[PDB]
C-alpha cells in the first residue's frame, strides 16, 4: 500500500509539483520507485505520446495514480509467493530474483517493437504490457522493492542492465535481454563477461545503484521526443529540474552518464547560476575516473560531441583520443557492436566531415587551425592507436580496408610540414601502444601519403593484387 504521507502532494498539477514529489520521496528512507516511475510515465504519456486536450500540464490525480499502483502491486504479490523463497539474513536468493524476472517477462505483449520510445516506465508496463530491455531490469528492481527485498539493486553498464543482490550485494543476475539476436542469459551471473574484458561488462567497473541512483536512472530514462523533429519542452524542463535536484543531493556523484545528460540539457537551455555544459562534461569524466577506474567510454564521447557541435576541432580530437585511450585496454567481443558502431562513425564520418570544413576554412585563411597544429595531428594518431590496440588480443577483429580510405584521407588533411613536427618515441611527442601504428610511423611524415602502404599496415591484408 501507498502510505498516507506519500499521498499529501496530490493532485500534481505542474512540473514543479512533480519535482516536489521527487524531493519528498528522496527525503524518505527508501524512495518509492513504483510510485515515481508511474508518475513519470503518466506525465510522459500525456506530454509526448498523446497531447490531445493538453492545455498546460496533465494533472495527476491520486485516484488515477493509486489505481495504477494497485494494478502493479496486485500483479506482483499474486504471482510471486515469498514463502516459496525463504530469506536468510535480510538477503534475497537467486531463485527469487529469477522468479521476479520471469513474472515481468511473462506479462509482456507477445510481439512488439522493442526499441520504440516511451516503453521504459511502469506506466507502459501496466497500460500497454510493453517494456524495453532496461525497462524490464528497472521493473524487476521496483517489484523487488515493493516485495520488501531491500538488497536487490539495478546494475548498469554503458549498453546493458541487470541486478545485484544477495550477501553484501555481491551477487549478479541477468534479468533482461541484451540487443537483438543475442543468446539470453537470464538468471546467470555476469562473471564470464567481466572475465573476457568486453566493453559490455566494463571489466567489472559497472554501476551498482543504490535506491537514489535508481531514481536518477528513471529520470535519465525520461524521453521528451514527440516525433523525429519535436521534443516536449515540458518534459525537457521536468527532466532538467529533477536532475538538478538529484545533483544537489549528491546522487549523480557516481553517475557519469547522468552528468552528461544534464550537460546536454544545459546546452539546450541554460539554467541561470548553474555550471556550464563543459564543466558538467568534465564532472562526468571525473566521476568515471574516481569511481569506475576510468574504464567508461561515453564520458569522453559526451565531451567530444559537444566540441564537434561547436566546431572546436582541436578539443574534439583531444576528447576522441582520450576515448580511444580507454578502449585500448578492452577486448572487442561479440556483443560489443554498439561501441564499434560509435567508433566507426567517428573515424569514418564525423572526423572526415570536421576536417573537410577545416580544410575549406584554412584555404580561406583561418589562423590557429587544427590542421596547422601538430598536437592535433598527434590526437588523430592517438585515436587510431587506441583502436588498433583495442583490436590486439580480441576474439573478433576491428579494422578492415573500409577504415583505410578514411585514415588516408584524414592524414592528408594535414600538410607534411605539420605532420613532421610530431616525434614518435618508443618506450610534440607521442608514444604508440599498438604494433599497427608503430609500423606505420615512417609512412606518417611523407609529403604525399603512401595510400597502398597505409592500407597494408592498417589491415590483415599482406599481399597486393596479382596482375
Numbering used by the authors: 2 to 53, 74 to 386, 399 to 460, 549 to 588
Task: Pull text from the paper.
pmcMenin, a 67 kDa protein encoded by the MEN1 (Multiple Endocrine Neoplasia 1) gene, is a chromatin adaptor protein that interacts with MLL1 (Mixed Lineage Leukemia 1, also known as KMT2A) to regulate the expression of multiple genes, including HOXA cluster genes. Menin has been identified as an essential oncogenic co-factor of MLL1 fusion proteins found in acute leukemia patients. MBM1 binds to the central cavity of menin, utilizing Phe9, Pro10, and Pro13 as energetic hotspots, which occupy well-defined hydrophobic pockets, and positively charged arginine residues (Arg8 and Arg12) that are involved in electrostatic interactions with the negatively charged binding site on menin. Importantly, recent clinical studies found emerging resistance to Revumenib treatment and patient relapse as a result of somatic mutations in MEN1, leading to point mutations of T349M, M327I/V, and G331R/D. Understanding how these mutations affect menin structure as well as the interaction with MLL1 and current menin inhibitors will be crucial in the development of a new generation of inhibitors maintaining their activity against menin mutants.
We also solved the crystal structures of these menin mutants, showing no structural changes in the MLL1 binding site on menin. We have also calculated the electrostatic potential for the wild-type, G331R, and G331D menin variants and found that in all cases the MBM1 site on menin has a strong negative charge that is minimally perturbed by either of the two G331 mutations. Point mutation G331D reduces the binding of the high-affinity MBM1 motif of MLL1 by 10-fold yet maintains the potent interaction with longer MLL1 fragments and shows a very slow rate of dissociation of MLL1. Then, we performed competition experiments with the G331D variant and found that incubations of 24 h or longer are needed to observe dissociation of the meninG331D–MLL14-43 complex. These results demonstrate that meninG331D binds MLL1 with a similar affinity as wild-type menin, but this complex undergoes a very slow dissociation and longer residence time, most likely due to the additional negative charge in the binding site introduced by the G331D mutation. As expected, no activity is observed for the G331D variant due to slow dissociation of the meninG331D–MLL1 complex.
